[PDB]
């Protein structure tokens, strides 16, 4: 997140860190004790065998005994278009079930077909690049955002912050867009650059796939 604020300690207990070596590379969202939702390109050319699904985290710069690391069992995709960046959603099955603590909780999704219009206030998060200076975020980061329809596709849900150069950057892909306590977006791609101020940041449109998510999660 560029131009954002630190999150309160585990204020968003559904926030997941997808790690490869020991470094963060994508974020995710816990939608069930044994399921994780993220971005399809986050696993496109990676050995999913080696990805550890870190959950219940705050500062990924050292070890937290409240953190619960998992591995990927099953990978579901509903037609990811790697070139057009369409349907950039993936459901990752867990290895096991997570302890629903105060630090780990199950996020919730909207209904199939729910479209947010321009003007709706949303919130983005991620451990991605920390902003202008300073790289990957050591501490989860927050950012108030508003939905835009201009310079966007309904094959996405788009987000702009008006009056400042701020928005999602590299490493935030797969992280959720919370709108009224509902997960409406998955961080897919930016245009021209992260906090460009002219091109809207694009999220994967969760509401278009819920019926598909419910067939895996139920």
């Amino acid at each position: 997140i560029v131009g954002g604020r630190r999150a309160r300690p585990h204020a968003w207990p559904f926030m997941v860190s997808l790690q490869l070596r020991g470094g963060h590379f994508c974020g995710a969202t816990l939608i069930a004790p044994n399921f994780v939702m993220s971005a399809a390109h986050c696993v496109a050319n990676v050995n999913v065998r080696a990805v550890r699904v870190v959950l219940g985290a705050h500062n990924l710069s050292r070890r937290e005994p409240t953190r619960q690391v998992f591995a990927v069992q099953r990978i579901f995709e509903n037609g990811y278009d790697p070139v057009n960046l369409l349907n950039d959603i993936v459901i990752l099955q867990l290895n096991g079930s997570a302890t629903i603590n105060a630090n780990v909780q199950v996020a919730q999704l909207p209904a199939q077909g729910r479209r947010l219009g321009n003007g709706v206030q949303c919130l983005a998060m991620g451990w991605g690049l920390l902003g202008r200076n300073r790289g990957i975020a050591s501490v989860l980061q927050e950012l108030n955002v508003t939905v835009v329809t201009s310079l966007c596709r309904r094959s996405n849900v788009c987000t702009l912050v008006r009056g400042r150069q701020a928005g999602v950057c590299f490493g935030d892909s797969g992280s959720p867009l919370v709108c009224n306590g509902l997960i409406h977006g998955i961080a897919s791609f930016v245009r021209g650059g992260c906090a460009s101020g002219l091109y809207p940041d694009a999220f994967a449109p969760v509401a278009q796939f819920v019926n598909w998510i419910d067939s895996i999660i139920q």
Partner: peptide, 8 residues
């Protein structure tokens, strides 16, 4: 690629 897309 920028205006084509810049997947993070």
């Amino acid at each position: 690629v920028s205006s084509p897309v810049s997947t993070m």
